[PDB]
Amino acid sequence: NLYSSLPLTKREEVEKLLNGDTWRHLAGELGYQPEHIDSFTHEACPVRALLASWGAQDSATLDALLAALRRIQRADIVESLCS
Amino acid sequence: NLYSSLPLTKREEVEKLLNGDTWRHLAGELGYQPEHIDSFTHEACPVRALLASWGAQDSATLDALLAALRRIQRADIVESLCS
Numbered sequence: 001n002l003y004s005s006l007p008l009t010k011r012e013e014v015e016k017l018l019n020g021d022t023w024r025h026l027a028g029e030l031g032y033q034p035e036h037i038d039s040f041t042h043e044a045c046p047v048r049a050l051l052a053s054w055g056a057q058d059s060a061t062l063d064a065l066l067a068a069l070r071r072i073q074r075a076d077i078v079e080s081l082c083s
Numbered sequence: 084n085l086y087s088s089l090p091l092t093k094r095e096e097v098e099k100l101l102n103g104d105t106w107r108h109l110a111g112e113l114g115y116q117p118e119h120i121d122s123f124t125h126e127a128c129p130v131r132a133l134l135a136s137w138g139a140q141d142s143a144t145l146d147a148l149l150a151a152l153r154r155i156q157r158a159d160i161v162e163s164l165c166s
């Protein structure tokens with residue numbers, strides 16, 4: 001159940017919810033080192049680019065993402081995405 | 084013919100086409116000052132948030148955007164969106 005496969009419309013909502021610093025926290029939890037995170041701030045849309053990059057692995061499931069969101073104490077985002 | 088009204092899937096192309104610094108140049112041409120532009124780097128997706136902010140005006144037409152792209156020497160982006 002790959003994250004990539006997710007329709008643009010829900011992905012759009014994912015990205016909206018990872019606002020501010022949250023994509024950085026998520027990236028840390030996903031195994032990205034801080035300088036690797038910093039590299040993504042060069043993109044026009046750091047959060048999308050991070051997820052496009054991460055989303056190219058085979059392990060990059062929606063549920064893997066939700067789990068990483070739980071692990072950074074953002075279950076509110078999970079609740080929000082699921083409701 | 085408002086930019087906002089544009090379908091998400093074309094807005095995706097726009098944002099992708101404004102890679103790197105381009106949205107900063109675009110914003111400058113659109114009337115935003117450098118520190119005002121700098122404020123959008125706090126968002127997870129600066130380019131989208133800038134366009135969302137710009138797009139709330141009634142004058143924020145796709146064609147106004149195209150003209151700002153010409154004025155910034157990015158006719159290539161215009162060509163791409165049009166073809």
Ligand SMILES: O=C(O)c1cc(S)ccc1[N+](=O)[O-]
Pocket residue numbers: 006010011062078081082083
């Ligand atoms: O629609 C789903 O497949 C979905 C389900 C849950 S529980 C959380 C986020 C989701 N999104 O947005 O993909």
Ligand SMILES: O=C(O)c1cc(S)ccc1[N+](=O)[O-]
Pocket residue numbers: 089093094096145161164165166
């Ligand atoms: O589809 C259109 O209305 C469109 C037309 C031209 S000429 C350029 C960009 C566009 N996009 O992407 O909206």
